[PDB]
Symmetry: C2
Subunit: 102 residues, 2 copies
């Protein structure tokens, strides 16, 4: 069963540029991983400096493998240094795709 992850986090004006760079780097690496079907990092049009992490994993096991990687630990550590303290990620098992448009 495919799994969808939704994450949000924000940075102060002072650290936003650094966070964007970090997020783009994390996305480039993660997309290469086993079971990673989608990994997008984006910025809220309604709130500058507020970001979203959107992920689709083939299964829970693949996601767990990702979460345990040293690169993930390193990324979390980097956030501490950017005083990014509000990262929250929640995942959900997904049913079959419902094609709404396109």
């Amino acid at each position: 069963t495919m799994v969808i992850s939704h994450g949000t986090l924000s940075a102060s004006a002072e650290h936003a540029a650094h966070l964007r760079q970090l997020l783009v780097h994390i996305a480039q690496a993660t997309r290469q991983e086993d079971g990673c079907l989608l990994y997008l990092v984006s910025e809220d049009l309604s709130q500058p400096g507020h970001f979203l992490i959107t992920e689709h994993w083939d299964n829970l096991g693949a996601m767990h493998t990702h979460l345990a990687l040293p690169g993930v630990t390193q990324a979390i550590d980097a956030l501490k240094h950017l005083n990014v303290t509000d990262l929250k990620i929640t995942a959900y098992e997904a049913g079959e795709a419902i094609n709404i448009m396109g």
Copy 2:
């Protein structure tokens, strides 16, 4: 709940109008019955590419939204901003799995 994941993009000529449209639709949609979340965002890895992230309490509430005249109008608006790549996929979501934070 039902999660919707939508993607679309625009040329630089039209992107400012697309951003304003997206913000407008999000502000409106958040007030609708059963709308738990409605975020519009821009891909950091790909300027001009947008994501529409929606969480609906139930499938019927999402259907009601999709049927609104305002939605039909927004879709027509996209056409005239030369957006040709709109894709929306929804999924019924299971129970929350806390990952971190």
